[PDB]
Design a protein around this ligand. Sequence first.
Ligand SMILES: [Cl-]
Ligand SMILES: [Cl-]
Ligand code: NA
Ligand code: NA
Ligand code: NA
Ligand code: NA
Ligand code: NA
Ligand code: NA
Ligand code: NA
Ligand code: NA
Ligand code: NA
Ligand code: NA
Lengths: 183, 185
Amino acid sequence: PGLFLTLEGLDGSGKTTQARRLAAFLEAQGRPVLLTREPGGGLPEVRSLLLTQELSPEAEYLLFSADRAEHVRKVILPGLAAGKVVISDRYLDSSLAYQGYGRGLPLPWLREVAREATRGLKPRLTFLLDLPPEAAGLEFFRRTREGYLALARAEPGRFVVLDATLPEEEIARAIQAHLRPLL
Amino acid sequence: PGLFLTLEGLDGSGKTTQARRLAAFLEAQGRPVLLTREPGGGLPEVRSLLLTQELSPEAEYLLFSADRAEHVRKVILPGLAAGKVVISDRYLDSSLAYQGYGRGLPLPWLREVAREATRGLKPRLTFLLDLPPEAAGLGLEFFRRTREGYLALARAEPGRFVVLDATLPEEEIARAIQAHLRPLL
Ligand SMILES: [Cl-]
Ligand SMILES: [Cl-]
Ligand code: NA
Ligand code: NA
Ligand code: NA
Ligand code: NA
Ligand code: NA
Ligand code: NA
Ligand code: NA
Ligand code: NA
Ligand code: NA
Ligand code: NA
């Protein structure tokens, strides 16, 4: 039946290091893992389109969504069906935080697009590396950072909020502890 | 105010020819005109990506929507704001017919996605160049679903669609378009 986990945070939060440590830790426990990421896990070329100058926030979200739709269908759901722990470094919450809270797109529209895009697939746990925004324009990063924390307040059983300024090995231990019962 | 017009139909239906003839007609009347098209009017790389890559219908629709979102904001809306007649060779109805009726995506979700993508911009008239796919065989079934989808769209919005027999001579089609358009000029 598989287990779906995601990592979230601003760039430079350690989200990527923790994703990779978590995969190693599960693979060293002998259990099959698939490590993936967004953007690009669905449509690797999306990275090009995303860099378009002056891209509207609507277009930006739709590009992330096109990647995400492919990613869920071709990578994530097949991996879960094989009984893998699938870990995504970024998933839907990244859009909600960056394009919703950061760029100001309406959350309900984002969720409706996502409903089909993701086939309703939600992570069992999402580890949010909460990084002060200055350590990542600043106003945008503040909105995005706070957005992530709003998302975590709204779904307090799914989100595990971690202080990204802690040493890496302490963050990893905290992630491992959250995960032990779901083994 | 500007006036937004679209052309729709199967590939090979004559859209691209009729869009050019309609633009020429409007130029002959001294009316400023902007000709554009989808896919690629917003994000040219979406067009070229989808030439050589086949994706889930959902992903394809979402890429086309990103293109459309950019197209509306950077090209169509600024043309209309300047008072141009903007003509697009393909717009939302393409996705509905091809990704909806053709590939099976649910129409109301497609329209909800489109609502913010397009900022609610609808054409005043849409000219549908209707013909059978053979006039543009298991591969034919997709195109028949798409062709029939377009006809379903048209019969649901008879105030917006004008349906033309695309198998007719190019000039006859053009004069019919002009007659439908004259009450709006
Ligand atoms: Cl990171
Ligand atoms: Cl054509
Ligand atoms: Na999405
Ligand atoms: Na997530
Ligand atoms: Na919603
Ligand atoms: Na945060
Ligand atoms: Na939430
Ligand atoms: Na149209
Ligand atoms: Na759309
Ligand atoms: Na059909
Ligand atoms: Na048709
Ligand atoms: Na029909």
